[PDB]
């Protein structure tokens, strides 16, 4: 019964592979040497004069079994198509998560399997990493007692970084004044592993966290009480693994859960979940709003699917094969999807990375959303 599922996965991938010419305008597959747990497009695009492609870049990491890990910047050529590693920097343990600082995108924070959060300026490390394997971060951020995944830079206050940990805490650092920086503030409101944390995109004092205690918490840094958030919501019937604030609608956010649902929230009335998106057959680990389309979000996880949702289709008639608000199911991955990123310069392009080393850069067909 174990290796029967292997046949199920192989046959579905055979059908998916056959159907890509009608479902996608772009599919690029690349096998990394090691899997990445993390993916984020860097903000820059280059469009060289008189070439048929543009050049984009991604922050990736490694997850090895007992070998030297690296923080990785890759380049991707997208048509108007190769994938190449531009730099590898020595990293202590697997890269749980890596995120660039909006106000200086050379600066990358990483979550390690130890309690340290690391900060690298990637332009200050050699082109080839040293074979010794020594990790020399530009800052070590102290405060946590365990590893974690949540990591968020404040887009409205340069150098302010949030991190969530398996120690039940959220740490805040102000990195602006290989030294050790202790946390400016530690928020202790959760009673279980804190899975994710994110700054509000507009209000510099405001952030959200989600945890294995099944709660969504909304925090305000101006509050003197670090053990109690401003709002505390029973969000889901299992662990909550991710959150994302809508970039166009300042009161709207989304949470993804081990209960297999994505929840839609309005900050002004957190007693009433706005909607529950249902179609995932297993735990959801990432949710991300489209940078380009206010009603579009995506979700991924353990069921090996990346679902794209359109909130404007909630309530439409049918005749079903799925709810009306499910726009697209990406079935290109044959293992758990660990992370994904919407490309900020090419609408509808997604990069998604899975546990079997696969990185896919893809775009659903135009007729599906238009």
């Amino acid at each position: 019964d174990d290796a029967v599922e292997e046949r199920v996965i192989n046959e579905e991938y055979k059908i998916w592979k056959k159907n890509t010419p009608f479902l996608y305008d772009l599919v690029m597959t690349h096998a990394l040497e090691w899997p990445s747990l993390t993916a984020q497009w860097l903000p820059d695009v280059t469009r060289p004069e008189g070439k048929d492609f543009s050049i984009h870049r991604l922050v990736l990491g490694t997850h090895t079994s007992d070998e030297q890990n690296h923080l990785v910047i890759a380049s991707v050529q997208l048509p108007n198509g190769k994938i190449e590693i531009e730099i590898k920097i020595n990293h202590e343990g697997e890269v749980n998560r890596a995120r660039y600082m909006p106000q200086n995108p050379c600066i990358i924070a990483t979550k390690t399997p130890s309690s340290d959060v690391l900060v690298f300026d990637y332009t200050k490390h050699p082109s080839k990493p040293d074979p010794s394997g020594e990790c020399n971060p530009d800052l070590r951020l102290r405060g946590h007692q365990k590893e974690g995944y949540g990591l968020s830079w404040n887009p409205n206050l340069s150098g302010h970084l949030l991190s969530a940990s398996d120690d039940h805490t959220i740490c805040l650092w102000d990195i602006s004044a290989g030294k050790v920086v202790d946390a400016k503030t530690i928020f202790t409101g959760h009673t279980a592993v804190v899975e994710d944390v994110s700054w509000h995109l507009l209000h510099e004092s405001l952030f959200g966290s989600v945890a294995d205690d099944q709660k969504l918490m909304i925090w305000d840094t101006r509050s003197n009480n670090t053990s109690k958030p401003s709002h505390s919501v029973d969000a889901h019937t299992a662990e909550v693994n991710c959150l994302s604030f809508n970039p166009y609608s300042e009161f709207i956010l989304a949470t993804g859960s081990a209960d297999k649902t994505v929840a839609l929230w309005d900050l002004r009335n957190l007693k009433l979940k706005l909607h529950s998106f249902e179609s995932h057959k297993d735990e959801i680990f990432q949710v991300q709003w489209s940078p380009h389309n206010e009603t579009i979000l995506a979700s991924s996880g353990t069921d090996r699917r990346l679902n794209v949702w359109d909130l404007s289709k909630i309530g439409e008639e049918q005749s079903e094969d799925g709810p009306p608000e499910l726009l697209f199911i990406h079935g290109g991955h044959t293992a758990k999807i660990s992370d994904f990123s919407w490309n900020p310069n090419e609408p509808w392009v997604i990069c998604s990375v899975s546990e079997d080393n696969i990185m896919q850069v893809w775009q659903m067909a135009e007729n599906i959303y238009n």
Binding site: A31, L32, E33, W34, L37, T64, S65, E94, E195, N357
Partner: peptide
Amino acid sequence: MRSKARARKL
């Protein structure tokens, strides 16, 4: 609390 798989090399 997620459980990382054991990573295989290509």
